Scaffold this active site. Structure first.
Site, PDB file in Angstrom:
ATOM      1  N   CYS A  25       2.710  -1.498   6.413  1.00  0.00           N
ATOM      2  CA  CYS A  25       2.165  -0.747   5.329  1.00  0.00           C
ATOM      3  C   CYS A  25       2.248  -1.891   3.912  1.00  0.00           C
ATOM      4  O   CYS A  25       1.516  -1.873   3.112  1.00  0.00           O
ATOM      5  CB  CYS A  25       3.414   0.367   4.863  1.00  0.00           C
ATOM      6  SG  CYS A  25       2.608   1.619   3.423  1.00  0.00           S
ATOM      7  N   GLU A  26       3.564  -2.325   3.867  1.00  0.00           N
ATOM      8  CA  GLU A  26       3.648  -3.152   2.684  1.00  0.00           C
ATOM      9  C   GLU A  26       2.653  -4.532   2.903  1.00  0.00           C
ATOM     10  O   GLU A  26       1.873  -4.915   2.056  1.00  0.00           O
ATOM     11  CB  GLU A  26       4.905  -3.697   2.368  1.00  0.00           C
ATOM     12  CG  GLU A  26       6.192  -2.725   2.469  1.00  0.00           C
ATOM     13  CD  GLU A  26       6.041  -1.806   1.196  1.00  0.00           C
ATOM     14  OE1 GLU A  26       5.807  -2.207   0.298  1.00  0.00           O
ATOM     15  OE2 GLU A  26       5.880  -0.394   1.506  1.00  0.00           O
ATOM     16  N   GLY A  27       2.499  -4.713   4.095  1.00  0.00           N
ATOM     17  CA  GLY A  27       1.248  -5.862   4.491  1.00  0.00           C
ATOM     18  C   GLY A  27       0.062  -5.536   4.114  1.00  0.00           C
ATOM     19  O   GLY A  27      -0.888  -6.509   3.479  1.00  0.00           O
TER      20      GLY A  27
END
Length: 248
Positions: free
Chosen positions: A166-168
């Site tokens: 998700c942070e990617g």
């Protein structure tokens, strides 16, 4: 009626590393950028404000050799709001407070989504990331039912998945870290700088806006990470929250 169904789901075979993590993020990235808007002086696409019941949201399924997990990314926050166990139930981040976003009322994960939940004093950055730990994490989340004993253990497994996946989508830095590391046999281990900066994307979303009207400003908030320049921010991040046009 009350359930806001996602249009389709993006299913990804994790075990078959045929596509790079760069391509994985690029595929999802192109579609979310269509939903975002430009802003003056911000190269990075700017999200819309938080609708509770949008037109659609990003439903994604990571499928391994043995297991399947669905993760719910509300496009408006690009945060992992909730999850689907293959037993046919959903979960949401929070306690004693569900949302009708996951379709019918999800269960509650009981905690937030940061290092303060798991360990507090130590960082999350000691966690290895790699193909094995993703597959293990997906298995370890898929085996869940309404009751299970290793709550904190399944929780640490989903913390590495959210930071990787998700942070990617918001962070080219953790994307390229995972891209080089996922295909390795040893995996890779992150650092304190990456660990804190990704989860505090609010700090990015204020910095990018403060750099909007002033193209050569210095921002003490962002300088701590070595990011003294908006150019350095733009090559580390990918997307920024809806920042209302206050002053910069």
């Amino acid at each position: 009626m009350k359930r806001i169904v996602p249009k389709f789901t993006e299913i990804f075979p994790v075990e078959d590393a045929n596509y790079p993590y760069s391509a994985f993020i690029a595929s999802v990235r192109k579609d979310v950028i269509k939903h975002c808007t430009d802003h003056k002086g911000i190269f990075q696409p700017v999200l819309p404000p938080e609708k509770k019941v949008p037109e659609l949201w990003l439903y994604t399924e990571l499928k391994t050799r043995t297991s399947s997990i669905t993760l719910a990314i509300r496009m408006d926050n690009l945060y992992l709001v909730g999850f689907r166990t293959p037993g046919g139930v959903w979960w949401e981040f929070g306690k004693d407070g569900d949302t009708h976003l996951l379709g019918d009322n999800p269960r509650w994960l009981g905690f937030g989504g940061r290092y303060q939940d798991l360990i507090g004093n130590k960082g999350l950055e000691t966690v290895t990331m790699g193909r094995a730990e993703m597959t293990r994490a997906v298995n370890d989340l898929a085996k869940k039912k309404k009751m299970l004993e290793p709550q904190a253990d399944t929780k640490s497994k989903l913390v590495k998945l959210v930071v990787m996946v998700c942070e990617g989508l918001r962070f080219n830095t953790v994307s390229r870290t995972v891209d080089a590391g996922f295909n390795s046999q040893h995996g890779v281990t992150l650092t304190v700088t990456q660990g804190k900066q990704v989860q505090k994307w609010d700090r990015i979303s204020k910095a990018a806006f403060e750099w909007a009207d002033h193209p050569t400003a210095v921002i003490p908030d962002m300088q701590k990470l070595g990011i003294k320049d908006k150019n350095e921010a733009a090559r580390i991040v990918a997307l920024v929250k809806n920042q209302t046009t206050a002053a910069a």
